[PDB]
């Protein structure tokens, strides 16, 4: 299913058909994307369960060498990092950066705190480690100077905001999909009715609520105007 199908299921269950509606499809996209993460956390944070392939998304990154702090000689070894800021992953699935082949390569996505200290083990000096810095970028670290030649990677994870990760998908075979509405929404079909009814309950009450509808330099809501 696509963003369009879910959006219009919500709009039609609310019957927000007219162009002169207070609640536009943008409200629906926002609520759907937030309730997706809400449900995914409620389902897959208590105890460890199998996560379906539907919850995952591959964002698609270009890496650039950057200094550790600045261009100084003693500021430490340099890192690669993604050109653009990366979405925050949720901590429930199998995050993975891979070199355009999911079935190949060993690039490890770890925590920020762990990545301060990695690679000291002599047998772990050739492993590339990844983590999202507080800057918002995905940083890479390794003790093997070869890692600085890496140009492109794909990052597959259950990203915390589906819209951000959908804007950064890799090109499909046909080509890029400009409209987010034509892209696929990242959630399992078993969790679609819960998500829809939560969003419809969210917007049902506000749908029929009054407005400050007179232009009289006055607040008209206490009068149910």
């Amino acid at each position: 299913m696509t963003y369009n199908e879910l959006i219009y299921m919500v709009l039609d269950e609310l019957k927000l058909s007219s162009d002169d509606s207070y609640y536009t499809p943008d409200h629906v996209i926002f609520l759907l994307v937030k309730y997706r993460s809400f449900l995914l956390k409620q389902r897959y944070s208590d105890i460890k369960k199998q996560i379906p392939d539907s919850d995952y998304q591959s964002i698609c990154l270009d890496l650039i060498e950057v200094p550790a702090i600045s261009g100084e000689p003693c500021e430490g070894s340099s890192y690669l990092r993604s050109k653009n800021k990366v979405p925050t992953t949720m901590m429930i699935g199998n995050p993975r950066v891979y070199p355009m082949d999911f079935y190949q390569g060993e690039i490890t996505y770890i925590s920020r705190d762990r990545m301060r200290y990695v690679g000291y083990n002599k047998f772990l000096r050739n492993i590339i480690y990844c983590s999202k810095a507080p800057d918002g970028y995905l940083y890479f670290k390794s003790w093997n100077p070869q890692f600085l030649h890496l140009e492109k990677v794909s990052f597959n994870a259950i990203f915390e905001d589906a819209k951000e990760a959908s804007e950064m998908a890799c090109p499909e075979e046909n080509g890029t999909i400009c409209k987010l509405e034509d892209k696929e929404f990242p959630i399992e079909d078993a969790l679609v009715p819960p998500l829809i009814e939560l969003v419809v309950k969210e917007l049902r009450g506000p749908e029929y609520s009054p407005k400050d509808e007179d232009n009289n330099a006055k607040d008209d809501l206490p009068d149910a105007r």
């Binding site: 369009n4 199908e5 219009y8 299921m9 709009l11 039609d12 927000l16 058909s17 007219s18 162009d19 002169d20 499809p25 509405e181």
Partner: protein
């Protein structure tokens, strides 16, 4: 009832030339009131706003038997070329121009994109202009292989918004009924553009109701200032 019988019964119900005070109408006046009663009654019956029947266009056998003889089917393949629509994929079809209310309306599609489903009969959905923008992108209520949106526009036209090419346009509507003209009217006079005699095409069941309504309209016309 025939035209002679409309006139004789109309006179009998109005007590024309009886001893008591009464009302006498010319055959043109009779035709005017009969046609007005006919059109009022069938519009009220279609919309279901008649309190006596309280039923809509085909909601019971009675109303079916009443308005069965106005139901006309129409088919067209010609598209009006130069007109301004609300979408790139909008085609315009002329309306028969004797249409009163469109009751069934369906569209056959001829396009190679919908493979092995070619010639699919598609439901033409009348859509308001509020709903149009949010229905172009709608995958459940918008245009598709099995659904076409129809909008009314100027000059008796139907703008059909479809995703696939529209080949044929089928309709079934309620027609302008023939007026009830009891006499060959003189030069200049006519009812609904008809000067010669015109019999009611509906069934004789509703002719007596039309007569009653016409009599009441006549009494209203003569006794609205007294």
């Amino acid at each position: 009832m025939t035209n002679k019988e409309f006139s004789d019964g109309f006179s009998t119900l109005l007590n024309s030339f009886g001893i008591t005070p009464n009302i006498t109408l010319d055959e043109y006046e009779k035709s005017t009131f009969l046609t007005n009663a006919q059109e009022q009654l069938i519009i009220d019956i279609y919309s279901g706003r008649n309190i006596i029947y309280g039923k809509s266009f085909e909601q019971t056998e009675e109303i079916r038997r009443y308005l069965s003889n106005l139901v006309e089917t129409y088919e067209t393949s010609t598209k009006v070329t130069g007109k301004l629509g609300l979408s790139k994929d909008s085609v315009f079809f002329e309306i028969p121009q004797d249409t009163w209310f469109i009751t069934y309306e369906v569209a056959f599609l001829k396009d190679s994109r919908l493979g092995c489903l070619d010639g699919i009969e598609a439901s033409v959905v009348p859509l308001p202009q509020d709903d149009l923008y949010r229905a172009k992108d709608n995958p459940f209520r918008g245009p598709s292989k099995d659904r076409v949106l129809r909008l009314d526009i100027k000059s008796d036209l139907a703008e059909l918004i479809s995703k696939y090419n529209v080949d044929k346009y089928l309709m079934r509507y309620i027609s302008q009924p023939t007026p009830i003209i009891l006499v060959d009217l003189p030069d200049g006079l006519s009812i609904n553009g008809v000067s010669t005699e015109s019999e009611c095409e509906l069934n004789p069941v509703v002719h007596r109701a039309i007569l009653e309504r016409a009599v009441q309209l006549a009494i209203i016309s003569k006794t609205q200032l007294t």
